[PDB]
């Protein structure tokens, strides 16, 4: 894939994962988009996560669809700055 | 390995997770799945984690189980979705 | 790219890590050192996080820029260890 | 490299996490064991870490020896498994 393609469906990703947290379980859109993407890089700090059935499977949701986007744009990210 | 047999074997994995979870740490069968996923993503929040020796052993052994076929069908998924 | 190289780029990454979390977050030189390399390596212990909107951008920026550069640098160094 | 050989630096590895979380951090040698797979495999619950600077130094040691030999040997496990 283009790597311009993969940027816009991380982008895609991040915008799901930010929308989704604050709405599901009602942090600030600042926690929200820090949240989405310490959980995509898999850092998972553990700070913010979801206390709701809901949030629960939306997280499943975001791991399965977010974590493998991330990791190959991060691999053509390192192309064009290395 | 096809992609629907990789399919099985982190569906197998998530029954096992989620099973023993529940069963050895007594979390409800819901937050178990969650933890499962959380897990073998290696996100690792810590809301959930287990307090017993016997659950430890067992987190061991989805921790040697399950890292790699997760990370084995999320790159499969990459290819169906990309 | 050389391996030396590779080594250059994950030590200036660790520098921008520890100096930011430091002077944004105020934490000591080394909790600050100790942090970059689990927030590099994906480990995300959670004992330490930020908790200003500054800090949380920061963090945002050390992630996508540092967790590819950490895994490149470990697996040239896994092949002159092994 | 040998997957017998892998099984043995991995089994090193998880000695010198073990000992050395014991015996710094002074958690049971079980404790140990279950931290020392927790982070090398960057799952980091942050249920246990290190809260001394001698602690924090020997984690970031763990992880630049570990994470790498870790993967390493679960895609190796991957294949006699698969
Ligand atoms: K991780
Ligand atoms: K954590
Ligand atoms: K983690
Ligand atoms: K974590
Ligand atoms: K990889």
Known sequence: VP???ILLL????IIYG???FHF???ESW???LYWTFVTIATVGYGDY???TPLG???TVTLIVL???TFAVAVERLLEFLI
Do not use: Q
Not at 10 to 13: D, F, I, K, S, Y
């Open 3 to 5: 790597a311009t393609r």
């Open 30 to 32: 600042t926690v929200s």
């Open 18 to 20: 930010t929308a989704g």
């Open 49 to 51: 996560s979801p206390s």
């Open 66 to 68: 977010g974590i493998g």
């Open 10 to 13: 991380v982008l895609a990703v």
């Open 24 to 26: 599901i379980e009602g």
């Open 56 to 58: 629960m499977y939306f």
